[PDB]
Amino acid sequence: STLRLLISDSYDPWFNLAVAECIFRQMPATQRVLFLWRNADTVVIGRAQNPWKECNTRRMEEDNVRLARRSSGGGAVFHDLGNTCFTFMAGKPEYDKTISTSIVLNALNALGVSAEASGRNDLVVKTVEGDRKVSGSAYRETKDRGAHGGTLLLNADLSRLANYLNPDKKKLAAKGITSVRSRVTNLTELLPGITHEQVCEAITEAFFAHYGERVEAEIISPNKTPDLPNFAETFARQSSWEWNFGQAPAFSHLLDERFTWGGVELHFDVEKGHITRAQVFTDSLNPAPLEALAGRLQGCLYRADMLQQECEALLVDFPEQEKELRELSAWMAGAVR
Numbered sequence: 547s548t549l550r551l552l553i554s555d556s557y558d559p560w561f562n563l564a565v566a567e568c569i570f571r572q573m574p575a576t577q578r579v580l581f582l583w584r585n586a587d588t589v590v591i592g593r594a595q596n597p598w599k600e601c602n603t604r605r606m607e608e609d610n611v612r613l614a615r616r617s618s619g620g621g622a623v624f625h626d627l628g629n630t631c632f633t634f635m636a637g638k639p640e641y642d643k644t645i646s647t648s649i650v651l652n653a654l655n656a657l658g659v660s661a662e663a664s665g666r667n668d669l670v671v672k673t674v675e676g677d678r679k680v681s682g683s684a685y686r687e688t689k690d691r692g693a694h695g696g697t698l699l700l701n702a703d704l705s706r707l708a709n710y711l712n713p714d715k716k717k718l719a720a721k722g723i724t725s726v727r728s729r730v731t732n733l734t735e736l737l738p739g740i741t742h743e744q745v746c747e748a749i750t751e752a753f754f755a756h757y758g759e760r761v762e763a764e765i766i767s768p769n770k771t772p773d774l775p776n777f778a779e780t781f782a783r784q785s786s787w788e789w790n791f792g793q794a795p796a797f798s799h800l801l802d803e804r805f806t807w808g809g810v811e812l813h814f815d816v817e818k819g820h821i822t823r824a825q826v827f828t829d830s831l832n833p834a835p836l837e838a839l840a841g842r843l844q845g846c847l848y849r850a851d852m853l854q855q856e857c858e859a860l861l862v863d864f865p866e867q868e869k870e871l872r873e874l875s876a877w878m879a880g881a882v883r
């Protein structure tokens with residue numbers, strides 16, 4: 547056949563992405579793939595985004611909310627079990643992202659909701675409060691293939707959506723794509739009790755309709771590594787800090803705090819998750835260890851656990867300022883989460 551339908555029973559955002567990443571390559575050029583999946587408590591960012599800048603990476607860590615960098619573009623979005631994800635995969639030149647959008651759109655109309663796409667990749671319903679966003683999307687192409695993945699806000703926690711997508715005021719000069727903040731709502735406010743299964747059928751039946759074929763859905767299990775080319779390597783890298791966080795565009799961070807022993811200001815040049823340069827500005831009466839720290843951060847990870855390593859390594863050479871340095875390491879680690 548020409549079609550392929552995949553349903554994920556895994557909620558690991560890293561897992562499902564690794565599946566697409568393995569389906570996207572393994573896919574025969576003549577094939578047309580639909581992928582239906584969900585994710586439990588995650589903030590998903592695009593390839594060219596800065597996690598610390600686009601979402602509350604600190605709040606997520608406190609609350610065990612995973613961060614995932616999708617291979618496609620777009621902005622930062624929050625995933626929750628009331629958030630349905632789809633992914634249409636075709637080959638060029640047959641591939642068109644408007645086709646997929648219409649399939650989803652037709653499917654929505656089959657359910658009794660009347661929405662239309664807008665912007666670059668939104669999907670907005672007309673409500674009493676006006677226009678509300680119930681979906682977004684992002685795309686990925688190569689020389690011969692294509693992939694249009696998107697969401698659908700069925701019954702996500704809108705509170706946690708706002709809470710994690712509202713980052714701590716940080717002082718950042720960052721390259722990359724920034725998110726386009728829109729007003730959102732849940733479809734359950736429109737079709738009370740709409741579930742993930744009900745939606746999947748619509749998107750599936752609309753997919754089967756526009757193509758005229760049918761196929762039995764292939765189910766993926768979480769308790770088993772799917773039989774895919776280099777999945778084990780894919781799922782491993784996709785899950786790494788070096789990808790989700792490291793593959794952020796080059797940026798800079800300005801830090802400041804007024805301690806009782808003086809004020810300290812830090813400038814961080816970060817690239818591939820690594821501090822390429824640290825500069826200290828202080829009015830402390832014993833600035834020698836701080837000017838020394840500035841050098842010791844040459845190449846250090848932009849992460850709270852490695853900064854504290856370098857600080858507890860500094861205490862050895864400068865034992866007199868043990869008190870002052872521990873306050874410093876405590877603050878420095880909390881500003882980079």
Ligand SMILES: Nc1ncnc2c1ncn2[C@@H]1O[C@H](COS(=O)(=O)NC(=O)CCCCc2cc3nc4ccc(O)cc4oc-3cc2=O)[C@@H](O)[C@H]1O
Pocket residue numbers: 563566567570590616617618619620621622623624625629631633667679680681682683684685686693694695696697698699707711724725726727728729730
């Ligand atoms: N879950 C949500 N759904 C819809 N809207 C949401 C959500 N959370 C917060 N929002 C609100 O709207 C804004 C969307 O911002 S945005 O338009 O820049 N950015 C976007 O619209 C990007 C949408 C990305 C959707 C997406 C597309 C994908 N495409 C893929 C394509 C290929 C592949 O292998 C994997 C893929 O995985 C994907 C995962 C995905 O989550 C957020 O800032 C927030 O105010």
